[PDB]
Design a protein around this ligand. Structure first.
Ligand SMILES: O=C1C[C@@H](C(=O)Nc2cccc(Cl)c2)c2ccccc21
Ligand SMILES: O=C1C[C@@H](C(=O)Nc2cccc(Cl)c2)c2ccccc21
Lengths: 305, 305
């Protein structure tokens, strides 16, 4: 028993991290097969960041201007191309540590592990969620750009996130591995609206099921509700509306616990309306929304990679 | 910016995990050089667990009774010995993936990463603290025994914890890598008192400094206190007494922020006495005690391994 915010084991990804330098800028890249992927803003100077002309800046660069180092080992760059907001540096050596992998574009409310890196070297790993507003609440310093987010299924790493930017509000923005930003963001040093966030309702419900499995049951009540009634409450409290698709995804946890999804919604409604009265659930005094239903089952059933 | 409960990158440790089977019991072991370390209760049956005679049970076992498998690869066992509550299985092959490593016995209130494993395969990684009462609040299912906790400094893994047991209270107990339990616990299926826990005061203060660095400043007040006055409050709220050694360890964070340690103690005193009034600090509605002062600096300064 017990319930923790658990990340994927990071080893498969650690073997793909390299350092990329262009001029006086160093950040991280991801070495898969004979391609290194990194944020395109490695080519910028400080005077460029206000609104870089990336096409013009990249024209000034040649293969030999990109220094790519894998531990102590220098890689030879034989092509470069820009795809959306990422560069792809073709190298003459396939990464011998390449895992089975996929590039995926994840949906808001899904979770993944981030391997924070500096100078192509891993510093730590943590789990987070893609917010409904397509930001992430990470832990990232200067030099972290190019760090990646991922999920693992058996032996296959699905890469979903590459870090690009900290917004002036202190939350984080980045792209999929084809260089497309999540959200409306652009890679320049400007104030940029993220727009209203909401709490991930289906994840909160998943975590309440995890609480029950773990014996934290005090918040279970004598009430039920309807999707319509609950969604009125969801609206007031800036929660995502719950759909039947969400109910369907919660089915396995409902079955395990014997607690109908709408009964659990009625518990959540009461917590929203009354607060926690100085109590905790799974070690938290807030309602936690960074665990998906898949996350809860995986952790509660001991799936390995 | 941002502050997360970040684990060490787990790759160096993933390469040391193996499966150990003895009779009908399977758990995890740690393969370093030509020794595999695992919990001694791998030799028990269900009828033994109430109070195993480990010496007598082990006499019945020979080298060939210990099946050790490293991925798909079977290791040949050429010696066995029991040290305290661990077995050491000598194998004929040094682990080629052995990192630089040390065995350390950590102090209560220190933190480490746990790599949860089943059948010798990694499932996830998370950070936690050794509680003042020498328990850990982990996430562990049947089959997790032999999973390890560790810290990394540059290229050296310091192993501090091996998982043995979930107590009836749902918290976790285990040993150092010489097989000595943390706390009063014994490896048998009995109710066992853990005794009063307390909150790790120096860690709470460290996290309040992390909050300030990150711009969460609302809890800073106009007050100061003394060690004596603060410790009276600590007592009432089941916090560890603060010592000058703790003040000394908080020195670097005091200097960074310009906030005297006893001023920060006065902030904490007010939070203890008044609660948070429905506010949050670094995403938490409780006072967090699982970050050491070293943790805060490391995360806030981007140290890599
Ligand atoms: O998390 C990050 C990445 C780095 C960043 O924000 N770069 C940046 C800033 C504006 C525009 C563009 Cl394209 C990149 C940084 C600098 C300081 C602290 C944290 C962090
Ligand atoms: O976290 C653990 C390890 C495993 C355990 O508790 N084993 C055990 C139980 C009593 C005595 C001794 Cl020596 C070992 C377990 C079983 C069920 C759920 C969680 C967990």
């Amino acid at each position: 028993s017990g319930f923790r915010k658990m990340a994927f084991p990071s080893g498969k990804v650690e073997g793909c991290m390299v350092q990329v330098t262009c001029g006086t800028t160093t950040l991280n890249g991801l070495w898969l097969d004979d391609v290194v992927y990194c944020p395109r803003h490695v080519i910028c100077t400080s005077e460029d960041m206000l609104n870089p002309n990336y096409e013009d800046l990249l024209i000034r660069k040649s293969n030999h201007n990109f220094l790519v180092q894998a531990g102590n080992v220098q890689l030879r760059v034989i092509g470069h191309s820009m795809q959306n907001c990422v560069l792809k540096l073709k190298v003459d050596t396939a990464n011998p540590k390449t895992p089975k992998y996929k590039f995926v574009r994840i949906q808001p409310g899904q979770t993944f592990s981030v391997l924070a890196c500096y100078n192509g070297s891993p510093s730590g790993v943590y789990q987070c969620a893609m917010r409904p507003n397509f930001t992430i609440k990470g832990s990232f310093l200067n030099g972290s750009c190019g760090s990646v987010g991922f999920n693992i299924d058996y032996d296959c790493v699905s890469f979903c996130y590459m870090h690009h930017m900290e917004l002036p509000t202190g939350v984080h923005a980045g792209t999929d591995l084809e260089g497309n930003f999540y959200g409306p963001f652009v890679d320049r040093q400007t104030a940029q609206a993220a727009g209203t966030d909401t709490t991930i309702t289906v994840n909160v419900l998943a975590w309440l099921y995890a609480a029950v499995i773990n014996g934290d049951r005090w918040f279970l009540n004598r009430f039920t509700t309807t999707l319509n009634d609950f969604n009125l409450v969801a609206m007031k409290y800036n929660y995502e509306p719950l759909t039947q698709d969400h109910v369907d995804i919660l089915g396995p946890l409902s079955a395990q616990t014997g607690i109908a999804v709408l009964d659990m919604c009625a518990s959540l409604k009461e917590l929203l309306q009354n607060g926690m009265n100085g109590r905790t659930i799974l070690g938290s005094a807030l309602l936690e929304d960074e665990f998906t239903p898949f996350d809860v089952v995986r952790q509660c059933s001991g799936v390995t990679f």
